[PDB]
Amino acid sequence: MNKTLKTKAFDDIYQNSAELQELLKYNTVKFHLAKVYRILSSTVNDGSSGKMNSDLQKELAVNYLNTLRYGGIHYNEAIEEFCQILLDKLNAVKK
Amino acid sequence: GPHMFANENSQLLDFIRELGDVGLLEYELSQQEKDVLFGS
């Protein structure tokens, strides 16, 4: 009943993973994912990201998820499963 | 470290990114929820 993704390759998983969507309902999940969304948009609140820099933002973004995944510091079960289920289908689409 | 193991994380990032771009990442936190996440 909500929005759809922008990339069809990604939208595929989002529609084909109920276990992923159930996790995304949790505000604890939703919150931590918003933390990283800030990063892919900008490294600073001045601006950043003109015609590059985004590949660098990739790192800073992973830096966050590294603390959210299995064996992190403030890792969450729904985030652990979130990344697992997500990447699961992302690797299961690779031919 | 610049581009960690596999490209899963890479896809994960833009995935979550698309969520917030269309309005799937929008949320609301109660006082209790803010205490456990922000700590205050």
UniProtKB/Swiss-Prot annotation, chain A:
Originating organism: Saccharomyces cerevisiae (strain ATCC 204508 / S288c) (Baker's yeast)
Domain of life (superkingdom): Eukaryota
Protein name, entry field: Protein HIT1
Keywords in alphabetical order: Metal-binding, Zinc, Zinc-finger
GO cellular component, one term: nucleus
Gene Ontology molecular function, alphabetical: zinc ion binding
GO biological process, one term: box C/D snoRNP assembly
Note: Present with 2730 molecules/cell in log phase SD medium.
From Swiss-Prot, chain B:
Domain of life: Eukaryota
Compartment annotation: Nucleus
Positions of disulphide bridges: none
Misc note: Present with 259 molecules/cell in log phase SD medium.
Function: Involved in a late nucleoplasmic step of 60S ribosomal subunit assembly.
Protein name, UniProt field: Ribosome assembly 1 protein
Organism for this UniProt entry: Saccharomyces cerevisiae (strain ATCC 204508 / S288c)
